Amino acid sequence: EEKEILWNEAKAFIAACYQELGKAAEVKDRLADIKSEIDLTGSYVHTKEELEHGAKMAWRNSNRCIGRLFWNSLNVIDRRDVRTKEEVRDALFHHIETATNNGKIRPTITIFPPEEKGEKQVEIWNHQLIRYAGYESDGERIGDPASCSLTAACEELGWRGERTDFDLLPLIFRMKGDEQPVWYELPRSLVIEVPITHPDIEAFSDLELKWYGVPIISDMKLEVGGIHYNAAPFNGWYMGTEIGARNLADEKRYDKLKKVASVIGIAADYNTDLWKDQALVELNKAVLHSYKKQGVSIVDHHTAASQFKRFEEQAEEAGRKLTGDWTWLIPPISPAATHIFHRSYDNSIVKPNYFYQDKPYE
Amino acid sequence: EEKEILWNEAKAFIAACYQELGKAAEVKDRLADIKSEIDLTGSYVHTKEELEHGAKMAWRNSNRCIGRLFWNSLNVIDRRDVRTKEEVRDALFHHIETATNNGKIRPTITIFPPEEKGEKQVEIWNHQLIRYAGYESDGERIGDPASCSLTAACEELGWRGERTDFDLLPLIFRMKGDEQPVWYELPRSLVIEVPITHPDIEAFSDLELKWYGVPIISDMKLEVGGIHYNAAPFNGWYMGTEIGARNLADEKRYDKLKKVASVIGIAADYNTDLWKDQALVELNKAVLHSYKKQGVSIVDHHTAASQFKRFEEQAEEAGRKLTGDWTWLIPPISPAATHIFHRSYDNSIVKPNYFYQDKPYE
Ligand code: HEM
Ligand code: HEM
Ligand SMILES: Cc1cc(N)nc(COC[C@H]2C[C@H](OCc3cc(C)cc(N)n3)CN2)c1
Ligand SMILES: Cc1cc(N)nc(COC[C@H]2C[C@H](OCc3cc(C)cc(N)n3)CN2)c1
Ligand SMILES: C[C@H](O)[C@H](O)[C@H]1CNc2nc(N)[nH]c(=O)c2N1
Ligand SMILES: C[C@H](O)[C@H](O)[C@H]1CNc2nc(N)[nH]c(=O)c2N1
Ligand SMILES: [Cl-]
Ligand SMILES: [Cl-]
Numbered sequence: 230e231e232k233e234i235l236w237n238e239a240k241a242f243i244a245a246c247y248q249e250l251g252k253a254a255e256v257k258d259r260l261a262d263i264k265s266e267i268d269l270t271g272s273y274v275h276t277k278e279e280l281e282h283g284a285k286m287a288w289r290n291s292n293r294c295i296g297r298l299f300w301n302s303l304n305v306i307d308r309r310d311v312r313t314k315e316e317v318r319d320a321l322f323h324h325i326e327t328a329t330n331n332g333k334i335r336p337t338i339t340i341f342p343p344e345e346k347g348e349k350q351v352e353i354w355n356h357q358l359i360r361y362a363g364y365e366s367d368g369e370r371i372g373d374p375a376s377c378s379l380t381a382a383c384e385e386l387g388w389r390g391e392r393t394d395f396d397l398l399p400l401i402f403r404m405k406g407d408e409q410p411v412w413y414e415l416p417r418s419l420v421i422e423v424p425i426t427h428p429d430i431e432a433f434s435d436l437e438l439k440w441y442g443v444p445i446i447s448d449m450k451l452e453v454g455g456i457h458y459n460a461a462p463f464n465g466w467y468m469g470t471e472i473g474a475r476n477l478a479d480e481k482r483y484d485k486l487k488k489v490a491s492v493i494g495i496a497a498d499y500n501t502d503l504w505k506d507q508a509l510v511e512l513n514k515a516v517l518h519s520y521k522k523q524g525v526s527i528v529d530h531h532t533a534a535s536q537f538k539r540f541e542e543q544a545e546e547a548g549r550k551l552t553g554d555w556t557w558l559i560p561p562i563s564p565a566a567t568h569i570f571h572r573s574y575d576n577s578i579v580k581p582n583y584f585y586q587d588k589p590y591e
Numbered sequence: 592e593e594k595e596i597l598w599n600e601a602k603a604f605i606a607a608c609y610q611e612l613g614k615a616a617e618v619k620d621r622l623a624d625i626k627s628e629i630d631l632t633g634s635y636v637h638t639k640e641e642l643e644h645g646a647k648m649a650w651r652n653s654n655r656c657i658g659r660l661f662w663n664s665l666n667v668i669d670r671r672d673v674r675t676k677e678e679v680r681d682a683l684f685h686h687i688e689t690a691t692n693n694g695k696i697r698p699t700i701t702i703f704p705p706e707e708k709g710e711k712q713v714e715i716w717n718h719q720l721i722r723y724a725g726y727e728s729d730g731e732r733i734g735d736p737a738s739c740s741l742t743a744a745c746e747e748l749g750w751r752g753e754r755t756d757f758d759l760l761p762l763i764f765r766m767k768g769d770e771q772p773v774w775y776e777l778p779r780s781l782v783i784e785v786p787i788t789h790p791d792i793e794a795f796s797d798l799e800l801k802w803y804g805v806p807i808i809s810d811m812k813l814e815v816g817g818i819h820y821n822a823a824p825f826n827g828w829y830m831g832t833e834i835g836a837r838n839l840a841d842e843k844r845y846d847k848l849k850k851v852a853s854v855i856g857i858a859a860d861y862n863t864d865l866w867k868d869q870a871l872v873e874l875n876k877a878v879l880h881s882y883k884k885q886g887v888s889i890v891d892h893h894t895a896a897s898q899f900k901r902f903e904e905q906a907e908e909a910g911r912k913l914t915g916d917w918t919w920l921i922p923p924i925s926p927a928a929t930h931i932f933h934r935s936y937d938n939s940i941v942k943p944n945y946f947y948q949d950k951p952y953e
Contacts, residue, residue, distance in 0.1 A: 474925075474927055475927060478927075478928075479927070486928075500891050500893040500894045500897075501879045501880075501883065501891045501894075502876065503872055503875055503876050503879070503891065503893075503924075505893065505925060505928045506872045506875070506924055506925045506928070507872050507876075509925055509928065510865055510868045510869050510872050513865055513868070514864065514865050514869075517863045517865070518863075521863065529862050529863045529865065531862040531865075531867065532862045532863075535862075555918065556917065556918070559926075561925075561926055561927035561932070562865075562868055562924070562925060562927075563836075563867060563868045563871055563923075563924060564921075564923055564926060565836055565837060565840075565841070565923035565924075566840075566848075566867045566868070566871065570923070
């Protein structure tokens with residue numbers, strides 16, 4: 230069954246991929262080559278070109294992503310050659326540096342060797358390559374609660390955080406053949422952070438908020454033509470609301486709205502005053518202003534939705550069905566001010582695509 | 592087939608209804624009575640009690656409604672006795688007066704005779720009993736664009752609006768046996784309106800915005816045990832965002848955000864300034880403040896979502912499955928500040944319920 234699922238996915242992917250690359254004539258022999266290779270080895274190896282275009286198709290098919298307009302300019306780094314943990318570590322350091330690009334963020338994915346018998350070659354433990362630790366003992370919360378279980382897993386392995394609200398977690402990953410993962414402290418010189426200030430309200434700096442420049446998702450599996458690349462971290466630049474309306478605002482995250490309300494000089498006592506909505510807007514203005522001021526790439530939700538409209542139009546003119554998850558595409562502030570809110574989207578899953586996978590801790 | 596669909600829906604409704612009313616023992620004979628009545632007459636008549644509880648169940652099952660906590664206190668007016676257009680008109684006038692209740696709004700439904708062969712007895716043309724006219728000729732828009740087709744239909748029948756941005760449309764409905772509907776001007780003494788002012792910003796009154804107090808939906812069919820009440824207008828009180836984030840804000844409605852931005856003293860030039868979001872928040876604060884000041888019932892989206900949480904909890908403790916449409920339940924401003932955003936809902940349709948129907952114009 231496994232080999233048959235593989236062969237079928239291979240067939241579908243090579244046809245579509247080569248059609249898109251104007252290489253439709255080469256499909257026949259490539260398929261024959263693949264079929265033999267699966268018969269002999271139980272799997273098949275992608276060409277550099279197939280892998281790069283597959284990663285791009287995968288982004289293009291990501292129903293929950295509003296930023297898909299730029300799918301075709303994904304920078305794809307092929308690291309199927311890595312065999313040692315030092316090479317894995319160095320590749321992750323490199324991804325951070327080249328994606329950050331002194332603040333002019335390059336959307337990038339680094340692809341590591343794929344699973345074999347469902348057997349991972351490299352198993353990355355981080356949810357994002359750069360993320361803040363979280364702690365909770367005796368009712369006092371420190372840092373990012375979303376990171377508590379990973380943080381506890383790191384500390385069990387001998388890492389220790391300074392217990393600020395913004396401890397950078399170490400890179401942590403396991404190699405095939407090792408029972409324990411290894412971890413490495415992130416060099417601070419590699420990580421850009423932005424302090425949050427407000428364009429008009431001087432007191433906003435009193436909150437001492439900051440966030441990291443580059444979200445680099447490292448817990449999803451890239452699937453391309455039946456090959457499962459479980460370790461393939463990828464990044465874009467942030468949309469402001471991700472930081473302002475969620476990471477810093479959610480009660481189960483940094484929960485900053487009451488403190489924001491206070492520094493902007495409004496009461497946080499009456500639902501009818503819409504103080505949460507107002508705090509949310511000023512916090513989100515501050516996030517966008519701060520990233521721009523530091524020259525770190527970011528996009529606001531209005532501009533992002535306009536870009537996505539163009540993605541829709543581009544899909545139609547290429548004759549490709551559009552897929553999307555309306556529940557994720559609408560921004561969490563003023564959703565009805567975007568065109569997304571007022572239409573519907575087909576939530577069908579199309580491959581290549583990125584998929585969630587189980588984490589080893591948890 | 593029709594009689595069989597009817598009988599099946601009757602069976603399901605009477606069982607559930609009587610179970611809820613502690614009258615489970617009476618189900619057997621009531622059903623037998625109904626079965627005979629369908630055999631003879633092709634239909635059946637609800638008791639006062641069945642009709643009232645059915646209307647309430649229908650509200651309870653309305654997946655898109657965040658206000659369902661108060662389902663059991665719906666005020667049900669039984670007007671199955673009406674036969675003349677004067678009686679219809681007077682019943683609609685009465686609904687407006689009693690639902691308005693000098694601003695302390697009573698959630699109310701008036702139920703008119705139901706369809707027979709799919710043949711309506713009373714066909715109401717209004718989408719809401721109280722709504723503003725809309726005009727467009729030579730690129731200048733006046734009033735509410737959502738009302739353009741109905742407005743043109745009224746004027747074709749000899750009504751003429753003053754062409755302010757807030758002309759009250761007349762009541763317009765057709766009786767079985769008449770080819771043309773009739774219309775009646777709304778007595779202004781019956782219609783409460785609220786001028787929109789802002790709690791802090793004096794200049795807000797310069798926009799000369801207002802809205803009507805009571806939304807009374809009159810274009811949906813109430814279905815109860817296979818009986819189709821096509822004419823059964825119902826109302827609640829507004830949630831502020833309906834007025835502030837949609838009716839007054841949507842580009843295809845009153846489109847007021849640029850004017851709001853200007854009176855609140857912010858530029859409307861850069862997406863990154865989040866001027867639309869900020870204008871939306873101040874406009875929504877003004878709407879809530881204005882209704883409260885005038886003593887007209889209204890609810891903000893935070894309070895409304897808290898009430899809905901209780902509706903969920905009440906459903907679970909009664910052993911009733913909960914249904915909902917997440918896409919309508921989240922408010923259009925700060926949705927992620929409500930619990931609704933962070934859970935999912937089963938969108939199954941359960942009857943009794945309210946359903947959209949085709950309009951005669953359009
Ligand atoms: C270039 C800038 C980018 C922006 C502004 C952007 C924006 C977003 C946003 C706002 C979300 C919703 C996230 C959430 O609410 O947690 C999202 C989800 C997603 N994006 Fe993008 N994105 C970008 C680039 C990329 C790239 C390069 C990829 C992959 C190659 C990608 C794949 C995805 C995926 C898979 C999700 C869903 C994640 C999940 O299920 O948790 N995006 N994106
Ligand atoms: C008492 C105060 C009430 C509040 C605050 C309230 C709130 C709302 C809101 C915000 C919506 C979404 C509307 C939209 O976006 O256009 C809605 C939809 C709805 N409500 Fe309620 N509601 C209330 C009372 C009622 C009552 C009394 C009924 C019926 C007996 C009802 C039945 C519905 C229905 C059927 C919809 C869906 C309408 C559609 O599909 O267009 N509601 N409600
Ligand atoms: C590449 C990228 C760019 C950008 N601007 N933003 C993102 C946001 O992705 C962040 C990730 C973190 C949470 O993951 C939650 C999650 C959990 C589970 C179990 C499944 C799933 N699909 N997603 C939500 N999306 C990713
Ligand atoms: C009873 C009630 C109370 C309250 N606070 N708000 C409401 C809002 O209902 C207003 C109505 C007007 C639009 O109707 C649109 C519509 C169109 C169509 C074709 C189907 C459908 N279900 N709904 C959206 N909901 C109703
Ligand atoms: C159907 C389409 O997604 C459309 O934008 C919906 C979305 N959610 C909504 N939610 C509410 N409350 N009211 C609406 O009119 C809509 N419109
Ligand atoms: C799944 C559940 O509805 C949950 O609240 C979703 C809704 N929409 C979302 N949209 C985005 N962009 N990000 C999220 O994490 C979520 N969470
Ligand atoms: Cl994030
Ligand atoms: Cl309305």
